[PDB]
Amino acid sequence: GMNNNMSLQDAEWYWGDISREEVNEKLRDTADGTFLVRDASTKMHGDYTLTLRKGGNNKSIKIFHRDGKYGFSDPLTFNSVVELINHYRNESLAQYNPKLDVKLLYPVSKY
């Protein structure tokens, strides 16, 4: 019984662990809505870093992973950027953090 439930590993927007330099290439044109997920914010509840464009600049708005999962609006159970992004871009980014309301509506990927 091969139960092949592939929710999220490599979305056409998602990265995981990168720098500013490939955030320079993806956050080039933009001023709003541009997710990717870099490193450089790893300590308390959150390893990788949902860097979002705000008025021309790459602002690191890091995920609530806790140990390694996904769930910001959820009690640490969502487990997929693809559904932790469907629910968030079609609603509000004041459900994640109420200091911004954009809603991840312009992410990039190289070409």
Side-chain angles (χ1 to χ4, degrees):
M2 190 182 175
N3 284 270
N4 193 87
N5 192 88
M6 288 182 175
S7 181
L8 181 275
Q9 67 194 271
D10 283 287
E12 292 180 272
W13 297 316
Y14 188 60
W15 246 140
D17 58 302
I18 63 147
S19 187
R20 179 280 191 95
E21 183 166 89
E22 293 196 275
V23 179
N24 207 330
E25 189 204 74
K26 291 172 71 157
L27 292 68
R28 198 80 175 189
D29 184 77
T30 58
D32 135 59
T34 309
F35 100 87
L36 25 60
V37 187
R38 77 175 174 208
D39 191 274
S41 295
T42 183
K43 198 66 239 75
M44 188 179 178
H45 281 20
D47 196 18
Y48 312 107
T49 307
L50 179 126
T51 293
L52 180 47
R53 205 90 186 248
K54 284 256 84 205
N57 194 10
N58 60 100
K59 191 182 289 187
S60 285
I61 295 296
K62 78 277 167 174
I63 307 289
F64 204 61
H65 294 94
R66 180 192 139 85
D67 305 294
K69 74 224 67 175
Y70 293 98
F72 225 113
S73 193
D74 149 273
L76 291 166
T77 303
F78 253 42
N79 280 280
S80 280
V81 178
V82 136
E83 200 51 53
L84 189 112
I85 230 289
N86 282 350
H87 185 272
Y88 291 72
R89 82 202 301 250
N90 198 90
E91 203 289 280
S92 179
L93 265 271
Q95 59 152 260
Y96 192 110
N97 277 331
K99 294 282 89 174
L100 43 56
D101 207 79
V102 287
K103 55 198 57 40
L104 326 173
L105 45 53
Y106 190 3
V108 181
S109 47
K110 197 168 298 300
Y111 189 82

